[PDB]
């Protein structure tokens, strides 16, 4: 019979590969606030405590 | 300057729910509720019911 022949085999592109996923990491960068706390305080002065 | 600003959150009422914003579209302009167990109103601008 006819014997049966190796397949050639698939030929291969050699190089150099990056890969990327989608981004889920928030952008951050560095804020200043600035504020001020103002507290008013109503206080009662009994005869022994406050 | 101000000396204190008491912000609460009240109910409407099922009768205020259903006869007037539902019905008509309208709000009462005067807050009855319950609250630390005690009946409280509040009039908007401290004038009469709108």
Do not use: L
């Not at chain 1, 804020?31 to 109503?42: C, I, L, P």
């Not at chain 2, 302009?29 to 401290?46: I, W």
Request: proline residues 5%; charged residues 30%.
């Amino acid at each position: 019979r006819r014997c049966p022949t190796r397949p050639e085999g698939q030929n291969y592109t050699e190089g150099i590969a990056v890969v990327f996923k989608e981004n889920i990491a928030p952008y951050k960068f560095k804020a200043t606030m600035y504020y001020k706390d103002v507290t008013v305080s109503q206080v009662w002065f009994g005869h022994r405590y406050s | 300057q101000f000396m204190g600003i008491f912000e609460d959150r009240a109910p409407v009422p099922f009768e205020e729910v259903i006869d007037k914003i539902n019905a008509k579209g309208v709000c009462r302009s005067t807050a009855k509720y319950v609250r630390n167990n005690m009946e409280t109103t509040a009039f908007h601008r401290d004038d009469h019911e709108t």
